[PDB]
Amino acid sequence: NWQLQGLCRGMDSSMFFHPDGERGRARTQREQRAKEMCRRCPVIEACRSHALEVGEPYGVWGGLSESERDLLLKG
Amino acid sequence: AVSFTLLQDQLQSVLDTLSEREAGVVRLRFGLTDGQPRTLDEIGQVYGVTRERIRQIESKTMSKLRHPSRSQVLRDGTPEERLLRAIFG
DNA sequence: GAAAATCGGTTGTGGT
DNA sequence: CACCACAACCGATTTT
Ligand code: SF4
Ligand SMILES: C[As](C)(=O)[O-]
């Protein structure tokens, strides 16, 4: 239900997931573009707690990169 | 209700934006190819990778299908229901 | 349910 | 441009 209000609802996953093999500068700038969208997003908080509650292994969710979440949950 | 046609339609549709490998794996796993699910090992053989790499690719794909960017099938026995319930399960 | 170990493609540098 | 050669790097993949 909270998904309906996400700012990324139409443009698909190009922006939030890394294609196979992406490294270096392309990888970090994709992450930045995504985060810049999330910061403006009216449901960031529900997006973030969802990703951490269920532990979404991939993508940018709620303004957090994959490895940010991996760092916030471990232990 | 024969809305099962248009659910296929829009599911073919969302699969079409995963990568080739991500789509092939979901297709082999649920048997949206010949109506016969394949084990994680059979899929490893097809892709020349271990079963564990298949499970990582599957997981990424589930992440992508449940992301808000493109998960417009939360409108509710059969493989396509198997895949649906496997996304929101 | 993973996490750690190792492999290998990429990137950047510098050559002919 | 090409090719090569590596080294470092770090995502992909294999092994616990
Ligand atoms: S937070 Fe980011 S990912 Fe989550 S809905 Fe908003 S824009 Fe989409
Ligand atoms: C070298 As292979 C593609 O069988 O992992």
Side-chain angles (χ1 to χ4, degrees):
Chain A
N1 43 4
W2 71 254
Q3 304 204 311
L4 310 178
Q5 282 179 335
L7 216 40
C8 47
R9 202 179 148 185
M11 95 243 326
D12 77 36
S13 289
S14 160
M15 196 159 317
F16 294 86
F17 285 85
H18 296 288
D20 292 334
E22 183 161 83
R23 59 165 51 233
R25 186 215 24 171
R27 199 193 176 70
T28 110
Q29 76 211 184
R30 176 179 316 261
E31 216 151 87
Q32 287 172 341
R33 285 182 288 254
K35 289 207 292 225
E36 204 67 322
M37 182 154 316
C38 291
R39 244 134 238 174
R40 278 142 62 211
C41 170
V43 283
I44 192 163
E45 279 324 315
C47 195
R48 159 160 172 136
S49 48
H50 178 276
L52 307 164
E53 274 334 74
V54 314
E56 285 302 353
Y58 294 81
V60 171
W61 295 71
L64 301 171
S65 72
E66 323 170 312
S67 76
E68 301 159 337
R69 291 189 316 271
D70 268 354
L71 178 91
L72 270 182
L73 299 157
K74 86 200 246 153
Chain B
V2 216
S3 28
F4 258 51
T5 311
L6 298 98
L7 172 87
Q8 269 167 302
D9 201 344
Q10 82 203 203
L11 168 56
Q12 304 148 11
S13 140
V14 310
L15 254 52
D16 288 335
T17 73
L18 304 174
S19 65
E20 300 289 4
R21 183 170 64 164
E22 285 155 356
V25 172
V26 315
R27 279 185 189 124
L28 290 157
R29 193 128 171 65
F30 294 85
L32 311 174
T33 41
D34 26 17
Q36 62 175 1
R38 295 288 208 304
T39 74
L40 290 174
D41 206 56
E42 302 165 321
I43 308 181
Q45 308 172 23
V46 171
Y47 282 101
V49 293
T50 53
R51 99 183 187 97
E52 182 74 19
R53 187 47 188 149
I54 298 312
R55 308 181 39 180
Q56 312 158 335
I57 294 165
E58 212 194 347
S59 207
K60 185 160 140 156
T61 301
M62 294 301 128
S63 272
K64 267 157 122 162
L65 299 161
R66 68 166 91 93
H67 202 257
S69 66
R70 32 125 153 201
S71 104
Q72 68 253 290
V73 277
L74 183 3
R75 304 245 232 205
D76 260 352
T78 162
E80 296 88 327
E81 111 188 345
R82 274 163 161 82
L83 184 261
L84 245 40
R85 283 289 185 264
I87 297 153
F88 314 102

